[PDB]
């Protein structure tokens, strides 16, 4: 369709507009193999802040259709976009699929580097201890007391990062403290991560999504992320966005006049690497309303 070539053009436009490194060759190979799954599924375009003056650009899709579940991994492997290094990360997706009933999956793409991440969403929420049999990083188990103590133990999804050999764990915000700003202040303090502004803390009371990143090199929790949805460009708190990301919320491409957004705040060791902002445009306009 034209829908697919529209999507490839919008992304090169973003990558160029916002100074994001990219590889036309790489984009081609991804779209050759995955283009239709973009036009036919929940689809989002991301820019992040990991480097002060230039955004990176990503694009991702979410497969909710029962019959298609598992084809993302198959497609990824058969075409060579995801090849096996025997890495500690490389066995996780098969293990997850045998252990847990799966209700959604998705692929994340880096406009320069190609296929970056694969998500698995469990059917329903599970005690995180049920994931302890998997070849996750040792740092997951060794923080089991910390996961329970901060009510980060209702596990619903895995994100497997192949560029960084790291794993994201996703947590439902079941506990009354998750609607409290003091919980996010105390969580960032306990992790010795960079403190949040009061504006962000206020927003986090109606937070609903928490993610934790673990990797095989480090005995420490590498970073965490909070996610909030916003219905449209206007609903976005723009005092939390630097100028480059302000421009992105006004000019991010989508097939609706006023797309919704998912914003992500990554936090890591204070004075260290991983405290930045993520902006996801709801390209089709049907991810955010759900």
Ligand X SMILES: CC(C)=CCC/C(C)=C/CSP(=O)(O)OP(=O)(O)O
Show binding-site residues. 41, 63, 65, 172, 208-209
Q: How far is CA 284 from CA 218, 251, 254, in A?
A: 38, 15, 6
38 touches 61 (CB < 8 A) = yes
Min separation Cβ 230 and ligand X, Å:
12
Binding of ligand X by 64 (CB under 6 A): no
Min separation Cβ 193 and ligand X, Å:
14
Judged by beta carbon, residue 29 or residue 161, the one nearer ligand X is 161
Min separation Cβ 173 and ligand X, Å:
13
Min separation Cβ 159 and ligand X, Å:
5
Q: Between residue 32 and residue 51, which ones bind ligand X under the rule CB under 6 A?
A: 42, 44
Angle formed at CA 20 by CA 93 and CA 234, multiple of 5 degrees? 90
> Near ligand X by CB under 6 A, which window of 58-66, 83-91, 125-133, 140-148?
58-66
> Near ligand X by CB under 6 A, which window of 24-32, 55-63, 182-190, 199-207?
55-63
Judged by beta carbon, residue 221 or residue 225, the one nearer ligand X is 225
Instruction: Give how many residues touch ligand X by CB under 6 A.
Output: 19
210 touches 225 (CB < 8 A) = yes
Contact residue for ligand X among 56, 106, 114, 259 (CB under 6 A): 106
Under DSSP, is residue 21 helix (H, G, I), strand (E, B) or coil?
A: coil
59 touches 20 (CB < 8 A) = no
Burial class (CB in 10 A: 0-12, 13-18, 19+), 104: buried
Contact residue for ligand X among 49, 55, 60, 172 (CB under 6 A): 60
Min separation Cβ 287 and ligand X, Å:
6
Per DSSP, helices labelled H in the chain are 2-17, 24-39, 71-78, 92-99, 138-141, 144-149, 181-190, 198-204, 243-251
Binding of ligand X by 110 (CB under 6 A): no
Give the integer Cα–Cα distance in Å for 123 and 97: 11
Q: Between residue 211 and residue 240, which ones bind ligand X under the rule CB under 6 A?
A: 211, 225, 227
> Near ligand X by CB under 6 A, which window of 57-65, 177-185, 231-239, 247-255?
57-65
Phi, psi at 87, each rounded to 5°:
-45, 155
Q: Between residue 65 and residue 94, which ones bind ligand X under the rule CB under 6 A?
A: none
Q: How far is CA 164 from CA 22, 64, 89, 160, 250, in A?
A: 18, 26, 9, 9, 31
Please report, in range form, the residues annotated as the binding site for Mg(2+). Answer: 41, 63, 65, 172, 208-209
Q: Interface with ligand X by CB under 6 A: which residues?
A: 42, 44, 60-62, 106, 117, 159, 161, 168, 209, 211, 225, 227, 262, 264, 278, 280, 287
């Amino acid at each position: 369709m034209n829908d697919v070539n529209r999507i490839r053009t919008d992304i090169i436009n973003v990558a160029k507009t916002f100074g994001a490194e990219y590889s036309e060759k790489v984009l081609d190979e991804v779209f050759q193999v995955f283009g239709e799954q973009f036009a036919d599924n929940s689809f989002m375009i991301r820019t992040s802040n990991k480097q002060p003056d230039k955004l990176g650009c990503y694009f991702r899709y979410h497969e909710e259709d029962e019959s298609q579940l598992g084809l993302a991994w198959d497609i990824a492997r058969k075409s060579g976009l995801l090849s096996d290094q025997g890495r500690p990360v490389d066995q996780l997706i098969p293990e997850i699929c045998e252990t847990f009933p799966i209700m959604a999956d998705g692929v994340d793409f880096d406009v320069k580097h190609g296929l970056a991440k694969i998500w698995q969403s469990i059917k329903g929420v599970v005690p995180v201890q049920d994931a302890f049999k998997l070849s996750l990083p040792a740092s997951v188990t060794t923080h089991s007391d910390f996961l329970k103590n901060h009510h980060l133990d209702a596990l619903y999804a895995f994100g497997i990062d192949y560029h960084h050999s790291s794993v994201n764990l996703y947590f439902d915000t079941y506990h009354p403290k998750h609607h409290t700003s003091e919980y996010y202040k105390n969580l960032l303090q306990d992790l010795q991560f960079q403190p949040p502004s009061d504006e962000l803390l206020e927003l986090l009371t109606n937070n609903g999504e928490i993610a934790l990143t673990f990797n095989f090199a480090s005995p420490r929790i590498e970073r965490l992320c909070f996610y909030l949805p916003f219905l449209n460009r206007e609903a976005v708190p723009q005092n939390l966005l630097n100028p480059l990301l302000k421009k992105y919320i006004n000019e991010a491409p989508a097939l609706v006049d006023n797309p919704g957004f998912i914003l992500g705040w990554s936090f890591g060791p204070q004075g260290g690497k991983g405290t930045y902002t993520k902006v996801d445009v709801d390209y089709h306009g049907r991810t955010v309303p759900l």
